[PDB]
């Protein structure tokens with residue numbers, strides 16, 4: 360329902376948007392959120408949904424807030440408030456200066472140097488997965504590629520058994536798009552229940568995997584603690600199992616519906632990197648936020664200490680103030696403005712791995728299956744939350760138009 364309106368919030372700024380079930384979801388999740396950018400909606404609004412919280416609707420305010428960590432703290436980054444309070448992953452739940460020291464360590468397992476260590480396996484997996492599907496002329500993209508590709512790469516990197524994916528994927532989804540069976544706190548507890556023993560084992564008998572590296576790592580010259588390691592590894596699981604997985608489906612859904620855009624990349628493959636960037640803007644999918652550390656007047660609005668504010672990374676690039684004709688996909692768009700990977704000191708550290716997985720997927724897919732479409736009569740459904748996604752994506756194609764490599 361709707362939580363009572365705090366006395367410091369003026370009635371004209373109330374817009375009851377539900378980030379976990381937006382009213383215009385049928386038109387597409389990005390379109391659902393874009394309602395916040397209509398001519399009749401203020402730059403900053405208050406929603407009584409999910410306990411009550413502010414929402415910045417424009418790239419300008421979103422960027423500004425992510426830059427000002429003194430006023431907008433990451434200590435409580437998720438909505439509902441109970442989820443934000445329970446959230447303690449590292450380095451995301453910390454503000455500078457303390458946060459910085461952990462970014463260096465994290466970068467050792469998800470940064471550019473880790474992309475080169477797995478460059479070959481990434482290539483091989485994408486090709487093998489796609490070739491296996493090619494002759495079928497059909498597939499359920501979400502489960503047949505979107506999930507297995509990024510997830511298997513992560514599990515390999517982290518040295519975890521593939522048979523554990525179903526369980527880990529369930530827990531992760533409860534922290535971003537809960538089905539109601541588990542509170543964030545419960546999902547977090549379960550994730551740690553899984554990680555604690557593995558961290559202890561890899562600290563006594565270190566390995567070359569991501570978990571061993573973090574567990575036996577150093578932060579600004581001193582040994583990382585078991586607790587810190589646990590909180591960092593938790594974030595790695597979540598980013599490994601619920602980020603690229605969702606973005607790939609949005610991208611393929613669009614490509615299946617746009618023969619002209621597929622054609623463009625087939626005739627001009629060198630434009631794939633640029634197309635990846637434009638797709639990251641058009642189909643941005645993350646939305647978390649911060650908590651006010653004190654009373655603060657922001658753009659004429661009085662924010663009270665403790666107030667939660669959602670700063671949708673998704674909205675910056677969809678904002679027409681940032682990009683003309685924002686809902687249109689233009690691979691030749693001049694300045695692709697967006698905050699899909701975040702903004703401020705918490706800028707995504709795994710963006711190099713993400714882009715590689717995306718670019719490799721587009722290249723190797725169009726190479727083998729250049730002509731495909733959404734299954735006849737199929738109605739694609741999306742889902743909204745901290746990270747948005749696609750429920751299912753049935754694709755079809757004529758095997759005769761495919762090429763085996």
Ligand code: HEM
Pocket residue numbers: 433436449450451452458462465469594595598599602603606644645647648672699700701702704705706707708709710712713
């Ligand atoms: C398209 C895929 C991805 C998107 C859209 C994405 C987006 C983001 C965003 C929005 C943030 C900042 C959140 C905040 O400020 O509270 C972030 C942080 C982070 N991401 Fe990504 N991410 C993606 C993939 C990944 C992957 C694959 C990894 C790991 C290999 C990863 C690792 C991280 C880490 C470690 C942080 C936390 C950095 C910090 O808090 O200092 N991300 N990501």
Ligand SMILES: CC1(C)[C@@H]2CC[C@@]1(C)C(=O)C2
Pocket residue numbers: 448451535597598602645646647745746
């Ligand atoms: C908001 C995010 C996308 C960012 C990385 C995974 C995520 C869900 C977090 O908890 C941090």
Ligand SMILES: [K+]
Pocket residue numbers: 434435436443444445446447452
């Ligand atoms: K917290």
